[PDB]
């Protein structure tokens, strides 16, 4: 009567029932691994919400027997097979942009904490470093740097990467972008500087912020090649996907001064620590629990989204009724 | 609002 | 035959010297009180450079026999009584804005941080917070809020103050100021909202930031009584000076939770330490070591700038060739 | 460059 939908690796539905509390029988999981999620939910499973800590190959898909679609809490799904999956049968979405602010302002913030080293000040008074003389102030705070005429270094102009442009410019900032698979114009559109290879922007950038969605060219993006191909003291901000940048590269080069700073919402190996990883003891280091995207407003409007979409779905028809799926040319 | 965690 | 001129409270003249080297002796006391300086220099100085890691009252100025100028490396003049000081013969200059933007830009950062919480996120994660699912995420960012829409609330539109003000509006922030002695129009040049009357600002922002020059009328500008005309969990952000807020009733509010969160980078008792004062013990709180001001550039510049002042001085004339003094008209 | 630190 009812087609059943669950939500893989979460166990709070109370946002999205309001919305499928007649056309579904809600449930939860909480499957932070993909073996698991319930029997009967692999069995009979119309449809699926999921966030991000959880992964889905072809291998695991092709074990739903019901599934017909996953809708991605999110802007973010390459934590999904979307290839694979369209193939299969199932139609996946996202949540286009619901937390682009949250980001975009998250992100200048970790490029502040940075330049105006505002998070190791307060960190060193909570240590005891006594600061008496201007003497010390240029010591404790050596490092801090003028912004206004610093070069921002933007890789994918995005929905996020273009609200930083905004706020970037609002600080002095000169900011310069890459996006390969971005349409020609844009930059006129917005006034800001494009070049068109990596090598250009990390050559021409003091600091490199990631704005790229992950996928199949740009992993690793960051590696110990193209950090050689960045400024000496340049800073990093990765407030996007783990897979772009190498930690163990990074770390080597945060060591060796090759990178005055860096600051990570995103990494490899989520969930992060400061004990375990190529970072286990990287100098000039910021780092938050993939974060930037949280805002009670946010959150609750993303899962309202979601849950619409399900909803679009287990009442219209598919593809033809979903606004934002992501393999609509897939099968 | 079902419980479908494995136990 | 050559003036003497004497560093108060410091000991580095490297930057100031190249300036002086050939119209005075330069010579530093490093006194970081007003009686550790040495004979010769009360007897001897016709001028004087200074930060603001010391105070002068008349009590102090009449102890200076040679002294004719005094010149504060920096904006802030509220350290020295330029009256007493005017009247007594001594002219008293200052940096008008070598670091406004390092400012403005530490001071949205101190915003950032507490909206977005990007510097408890790390210090959580510093100290073994482990962060799996997106459960636990909204749990330890539990406190972080859009800004689209919010309104900040600003005490003081000046040189800093106004540069807050573009920073601020780049990220969705609804600004409106309050500054009696302010010329009135300003606002429509600068497309912002203004309040006449503390009480009114108070009343309509979510968070505020002082950026007011301290003086004789403001000081404890928000105590008990002004703080009880903020909003709930308002949010605080003070990078003027320490004698602007009462920081018992701050610690106070923390405490109670009538303020969702506070950022100091100047206090009342500086140098400041988390162990000592009403915030021995105060909840979500942000403390830089008064280094807003800091950096490699701004630095020199206002030194540069500070030494000008001090040959335009020794070799002009008293105050009709001092391009910034504060006391032109007391004497 | 003169030392006139109260020794
Ligand atoms: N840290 C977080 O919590 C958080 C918050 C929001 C989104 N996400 C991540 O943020 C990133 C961007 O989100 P968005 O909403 O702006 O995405 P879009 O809206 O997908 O923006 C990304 C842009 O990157 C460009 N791009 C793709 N591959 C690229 C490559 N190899 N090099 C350069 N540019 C490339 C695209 O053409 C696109 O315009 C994604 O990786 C997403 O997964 C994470
Ligand atoms: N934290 C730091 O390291 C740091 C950095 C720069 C300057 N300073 C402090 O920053 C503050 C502002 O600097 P600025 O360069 O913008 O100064 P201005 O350039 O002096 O700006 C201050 C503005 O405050 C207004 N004002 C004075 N009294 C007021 C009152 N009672 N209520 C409301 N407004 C009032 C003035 O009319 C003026 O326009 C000062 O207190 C200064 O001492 C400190």
């Given at each position: 009567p009812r087609p059943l939908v669950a939500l893989l690796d979460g166990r709070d539905c109370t946002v999205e029932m309001p919305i499928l509390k007649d056309v579904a029988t809600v449930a939860f999981?909480?499957?932070?691994?993909?073996?698991?999620?319930?029997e009967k939910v692999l069995n009979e499973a119309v449809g699926a919400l999921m966030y991000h800590t959880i992964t889905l190959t072809r291998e695991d898909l092709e074990?739903?027997?019901?599934?017909r679609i996953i809708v991605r809490i999110?802007?973010?799904?390459?934590?999904?097979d979307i290839k694979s999956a369209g193939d299969l049968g199932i139609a996946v979405c996202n949540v286009?942009?619901?937390?682009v602010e949250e980001t975009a302002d998250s992100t200048l913030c970790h490029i502040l904490n940075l330049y105006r080293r505002t998070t190791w000040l307060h960190q060193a008074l909570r240590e005891g470093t006594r600061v008496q003389s201007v003497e010390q102030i240029r010591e404790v705070?050596?490092?801090?740097?003028?912004?206004?005429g610093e070069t921002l270094g933007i890789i994918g102009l995005g929905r996020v990467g273009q609200a930083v442009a905004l706020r970037a410019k609002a600080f002095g900032f000169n900011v310069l972008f890459y996006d390969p698979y971005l349409s020609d114009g844009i930059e006129r559109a917005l006034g800001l500087q494009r070049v068109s290879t990596l090598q250009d922007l990390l050559f021409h950038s003091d600091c490199v912020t990631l704005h790229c969605g992950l996928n199949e060219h740009n992993?690793?993006?960051?590696?110990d090649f193209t950090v050689k191909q960045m400024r000496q003291g340049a800073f990093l901000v990765n407030?996007?996907?783990?897979?772009?940048?190498?930690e163990k590269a990074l770390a080597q080069a945060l060591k060796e001064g090759r990178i005055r700073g860096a600051a990570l919402?995103?990494?490899?190996?989520?969930?992060?620590?400061?004990?375990?990883?190529?970072?286990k003891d990287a100098p000039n280091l910021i780092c938050t629990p993939?974060?930037?995207?949280?805002?009670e407003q946010a959150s609750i409007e993303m899962r309202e989204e979601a849950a619409r979409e399900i909803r679009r779905a287990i009442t219209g028809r598919i593809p033809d009724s979903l606004?934002?799926?992501?393999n609509k040319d897939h099968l | 609002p079902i419980d479908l965690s494995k136990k």
């Amino acid at each position: 009567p009812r087609p059943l939908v669950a939500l893989l690796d979460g166990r709070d539905c109370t946002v999205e029932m309001p919305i499928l509390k007649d056309v579904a029988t809600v449930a939860f999981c909480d499957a932070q691994s993909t073996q698991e999620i319930h029997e009967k939910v692999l069995n009979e499973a119309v449809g699926a919400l999921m966030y991000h800590t959880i992964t889905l190959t072809r291998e695991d898909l092709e074990k739903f027997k019901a599934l017909r679609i996953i809708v991605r809490i999110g802007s973010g799904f390459d934590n999904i097979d979307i290839k694979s999956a369209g193939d299969l049968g199932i139609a996946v979405c996202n949540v286009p942009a619901a937390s682009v602010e949250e980001t975009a302002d998250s992100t200048l913030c970790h490029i502040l904490n940075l330049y105006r080293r505002t998070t190791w000040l307060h960190q060193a008074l909570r240590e005891g470093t006594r600061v008496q003389s201007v003497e010390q102030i240029r010591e404790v705070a050596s490092g801090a740097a003028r912004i206004r005429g610093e070069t921002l270094g933007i890789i994918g102009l995005g929905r996020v990467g273009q609200a930083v442009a905004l706020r970037a410019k609002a600080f002095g900032f000169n900011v310069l972008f890459y996006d390969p698979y971005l349409s020609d114009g844009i930059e006129r559109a917005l006034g800001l500087q494009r070049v068109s290879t990596l090598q250009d922007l990390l050559f021409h950038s003091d600091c490199v912020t990631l704005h790229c969605g992950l996928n199949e060219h740009n992993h690793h993006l960051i590696n110990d090649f193209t950090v050689k191909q960045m400024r000496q003291g340049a800073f990093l901000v990765n407030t996007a996907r783990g897979g772009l940048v190498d930690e163990k590269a990074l770390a080597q080069a945060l060591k060796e001064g090759r990178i005055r700073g860096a600051a990570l919402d995103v990494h490899e190996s989520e969930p992060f620590s400061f004990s375990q990883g190529p970072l286990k003891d990287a100098p000039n280091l910021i780092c938050t629990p993939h974060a930037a995207w949280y805002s009670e407003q946010a959150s609750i409007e993303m899962r309202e989204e979601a849950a619409r979409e399900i909803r679009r779905a287990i009442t219209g028809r598919i593809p033809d009724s979903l606004k934002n799926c992501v393999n609509k040319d897939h099968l | 609002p079902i419980d479908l965690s494995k136990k």
